[PDB]
Amino acid sequence: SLQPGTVLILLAGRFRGKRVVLLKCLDQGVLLVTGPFKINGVPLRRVNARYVIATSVKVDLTGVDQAKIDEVAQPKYFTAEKAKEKASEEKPQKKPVSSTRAADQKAIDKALIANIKKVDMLASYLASSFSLRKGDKPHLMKF
Amino acid sequence: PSEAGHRLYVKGRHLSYQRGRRNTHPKTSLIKIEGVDDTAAANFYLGKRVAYVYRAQKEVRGTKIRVIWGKITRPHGNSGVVRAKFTHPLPARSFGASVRIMLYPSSI
Amino acid sequence: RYAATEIAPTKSARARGSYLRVSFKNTRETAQAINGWKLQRALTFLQNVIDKKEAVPMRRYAGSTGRTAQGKQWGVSRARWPVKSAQFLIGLLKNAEANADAKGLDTGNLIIKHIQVNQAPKSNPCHIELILTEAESHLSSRQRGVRIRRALT
Amino acid sequence: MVAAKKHVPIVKKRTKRFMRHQSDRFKCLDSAWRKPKGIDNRVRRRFKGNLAMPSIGYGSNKKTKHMMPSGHKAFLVHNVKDVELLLMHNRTYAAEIAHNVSSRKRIDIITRAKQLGVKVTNAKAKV
Amino acid sequence: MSSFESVVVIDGKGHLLGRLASIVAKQLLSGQKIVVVRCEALNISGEFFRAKLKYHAYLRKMTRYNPTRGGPFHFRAPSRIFYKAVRGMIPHKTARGAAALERLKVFEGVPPPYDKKKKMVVPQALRVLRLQPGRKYCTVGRLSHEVGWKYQDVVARLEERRKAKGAAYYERKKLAARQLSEAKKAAAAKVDPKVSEALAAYGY
RNA sequence: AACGCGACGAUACUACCCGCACGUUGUAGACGUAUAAGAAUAGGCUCCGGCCUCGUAUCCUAGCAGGCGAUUCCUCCGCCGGCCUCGAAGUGGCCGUCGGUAAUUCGCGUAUUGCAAUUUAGACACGCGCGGGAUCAAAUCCUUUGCAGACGACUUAGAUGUG
RNA sequence: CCCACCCAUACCCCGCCCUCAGGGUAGAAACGAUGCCCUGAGGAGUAGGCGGCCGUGGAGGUCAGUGACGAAGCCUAGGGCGUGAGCCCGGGUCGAACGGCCUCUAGUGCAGAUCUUGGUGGUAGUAGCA
RNA sequence: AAGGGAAGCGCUUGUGACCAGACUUGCGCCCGGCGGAUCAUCCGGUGUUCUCACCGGUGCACUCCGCCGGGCUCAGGCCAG
């Protein structure tokens, strides 16, 4: 159900309800996803397949740099400056985004965002949170 | 102005324990999920998470909300009521009480 | 030694009597009646009990006790006039007042902070004691993050 | 050292005591277990809803018997010679100072055991 | 559809006493708040002389020495009859049963708090859906009136007033629905050809 | 009904009412807690075209837990006043002002809570605080009375008056 | 008559305890061999039979045992071990002796006996004090 | 703290009150600064289990014994995915 370039619905974590786009499927059940940030605020981040839900909206990935994605897919990209950043955090101010990280998003979200602005109302879909109304049945409704 | 709901769980009601005519077993509880009517509907939610959320008197680590976690194990009967196993048996005062049934781990 | 050991001895006056040949039950009832009262109010009440103007309510040891209208002061029906225990308690309260005067406390603002009646070696005598006093985080990362975001916004 | 030898998890088949019948009703009866010899009483007959009887089925695992939750076995220590006996068992045994040992002898035992790598169950008694 | 609501109001007209009480008791013990109205409009299967005979036997049963305390309090109101059925079906001598009975409410007629609320129906207890057409039935209100309920006429007059007010409300509903129909067609052109066919394809 | 209820008078203290700062305050258990015809069932509804197994329906539902700024919109919502309405255990409408408001589109921010950890967020009730208005009470004991009485209890009377 | 479902200590899988049964373990780098390892089966219980353990007073040997820097005893909404009888530790009190281990010894283990002695309850501030 | 014509007891939660454990880092490698001369080999004596050790001599900068300013690995407590 999940392929490179598929819209996912996060069910847990800080970004709960936030519909995102899965770009690359990693190993041991982890997934590399992104908003894109300019749409719903979700950055280039890795989540769990058991906590995502796969919709059938599939977005085109033509023109997207696979090499750049495969660099973020490495096993120390996110958990690297983690020790230094948290320690440095110790009036409150927003911790700064690794120059490298703010620099990477822009590339991938520029290409992906362009292919999303093409499909009718898709920006609106991705920017909105999924929520459960009254009378809707998760075992019957098709995603 | 979002003026919209923020629910991501399915409502459920802790009804009772798995019991005989006399003997009661607090290990496994009976949960009535909102909108489930039959065993196929139950089979969709087998394996899903369930949380009993209640309010306490003392705030221990920033909140008075305490939660008991468990999972849906197997369907019960023919009416969609499910059996659930929790890390601790439920207080037995929460018969007919609310539980939150979470969709993870997901398979769809 | 006294039962109430949580009161400083420099701020309170203490009175004691042992092997008192007065009824333990009646003395308990009148001590419970005068518990927590001002010294002047308690002395006036005890003198009234002597003069049959006010009655001590019998709460625990009140089997087959005659009724009297004075019981309405306590919302109870069974009241009595324990005259001899009243005299003994008057003597002990006077001893406590003399001790307070010796220590230099203000007798106009003393309350019966502690009063206690125990059984003595056996007729059923009792011990009485009383004390008068002057009346006067391990937060998680997610919660830290949500709180930081709330502080910013 | 501080850490104990690797062991299988310590499981307790029953965490509460086996109180004597009617000990909650009569104060002349202590709570220590006594097997009832009456032919008609439901506790002996094993009727449901009554007190359980001690049995060998509750016996703890052989590899975790006599083990504290830290994984050590308590050895009653009276002096420096006893902790020197306990030398060769740092990871399996802990030292429990006898209740009648004086404070200075306790200080000496604690110093020797800290040199020795041995856990002391009651190292903070008279501090 | 196994839906949970805050409080559900059940219109008691045309409902079998025992079956409705069974459904209500199960809901109360599962944790749903129930408000039953028109207990005088409730129905009992069988014939009226059989129901009256049963109630007269109930009256016969009484405590000797002291009728004031410990005796069977013979409540004559239809709401109390339905409450008696529900209490007999709920374990009232427990804290759980007391909580369920505190979740239950019953009234005669439809009080003004509940006249503007939606009244639901239980098809599993309806007379017209359950009984065979040739079979007899009686009215709990009639039984209560013939055993000593003093307020049949007052409830009847209040129901007449409520029905008149409901007729006025329904004339207003007619006006609103007619205007809604005219408004839909009037903006059926002024909209967007795509949206219209888009909704038709998506089922709206 | 001494653990059923209604109307009214006076309510000193305390703080009676009003607004929010809320509470490390409680709740057999919020998370869209949305939805009023009546009546019949061997019939009914209607705009009078027609329609009715089917509430698997209608409303509402997008936006840092929902930010800031624009083109465009007169739609929805709430608080206060005015006119009336609702009494079965008491409310809604109309007008008006005032505040908010994606039906279309766009821009600038969200990152780091680090792969999940109740999304501490509702209501009523209760309590501490201020700053605005206001109020300024009784009962019991005591004496007396005898329409009352085993004792309590009850009917009476004690403040300048036919005491 | 047909379908699905609920559960007993019953039946099946796994873990652990005990018992019984069947095997292995020396030119010892060898063992509380009264030990250790492997496999299988079994598990209610009156009268009765057998075995192992817990506890008390005193005796011999030993721990070059503990102790006025606090023995024993007692109290504890404080802990740890043992299936259990019981054993060990912490806190408070206290003041002068006591304990573990192998044997010996016996006036050695209590809920009953309308038990013995002593102390103390409800009845009850009641009957009553002519 | 509980209490609407008994209490007391078993299994299992929950609330309140109160506590015993666990951890505080250990092990081994790559660096540098060191402080030192108990590296090896050989010689004489001694004791032993007749080939192993102990003493004194010899041996002093990629040889041995401890510390510091760093880096890496592994093993490390509770609850979990």
Q: Can you put this structure into words, describing what you see?
A:
This is part of a larger assembly, with chains A (143 residues), B (108 residues), C (153 residues), D (127 residues) and E (204 residues). Chain B is mainly beta and 108 residues long. Chain B has one helix at 39-45; strands spanning 9-19, 24-33, 49-55, 65-75, 82-86, 97-102. Chain B is 6% helix and 46% strand. The longest helix of chain B has 7 residues, at 39-45. Chain C has 153 residues and is α+β, with helices and mostly antiparallel strands. The termini of chain C are far apart. In chain C, strand 4 and strand 5 (126-134) form a beta hairpin. Chain D has 127 residues and is an alpha/beta fold. Chain D has helices at residues 42-45, 80-85, 103-116; strands spanning 73-77, 93-97, 119-120. Chain D has a 3-stranded parallel sheet. The chains are: A alpha+beta (143), B mainly beta (108), C alpha+beta (153), D alpha/beta (127), E alpha/beta (204). The interface between A and C is small, with 3 and 6 residues. Chain D binds 3 RNA strands through strand 1 and helix 3. Chain E: Belongs to the universal ribosomal protein uL13 family. Chain E: InterPro entries: Ribosomal_uL13, Ribosomal_uL13_CS, Ribosomal_uL13_euk/arc, Ribosomal_uL13_sf.
Keyword list:
part of a larger assembly, 5 chains, A: 143 residues, alpha+beta, five-stranded antiparallel sheet, 5 helices, 30% helix, C: 153 residues, three-stranded antiparallel sheet, two-stranded antiparallel ribbon, 37% helix, RNA-binding, structural constituent of ribosome (chain A)
* Total beta strands of chain C: 5
How helical, in percent, are the residues of chain D? 10-25%
Strand adjacency order, main sheet of chain D: 1-2-3
The ordered string of helix (H) and strand (E) elements of chain C is EHHEEHEEH
Task: Enumerate how many helices of chain C there are, as a single number.
Answer: 4
Q: What spatial order of strands do you see in the largest sheet of chain C?
A: 1-5-4
Rg of chain D over CA atoms, rounded to whole Å, is 20 Å
Query: Largest chain-chain contact?
Result: A-B, 21 and 19 residues
How are the SSEs placed, and which strands pair?
The structure is cut from a larger assembly and holds chains A (143 residues), B (108 residues), C (153 residues), D (127 residues) and E (204 residues).
Chain A: E1 6-10, E2 19-25, E3 30-34, H1 37-40, E4 45-48, E5 52-58, H2 66-72, H3 82-89, H4 99-116, H5 122-127
Antiparallel strand pairs in A: 1-2, 1-5, 2-3, 3-4
Chain B: E1 9-19, E2 24-33, H1 39-45, E3 49-55, E4 65-75, E5 82-86, E6 97-102
Antiparallel strand pairs in B: 1-2, 1-6, 2-5, 3-4, 3-6, 4-5
Chain D: H1 42-45, E1 73-77, H2 80-85, E2 93-97, H3 103-116, E3 119-120
Chain D binds three RNA strands through strand 1 and helix 3.
Family (chain B): Belongs to the eukaryotic ribosomal protein eL33 family.
GO cellular component, one term (chain B): ribonucleoprotein complex
Protein name (chain B): 60S ribosomal protein l33-like protein
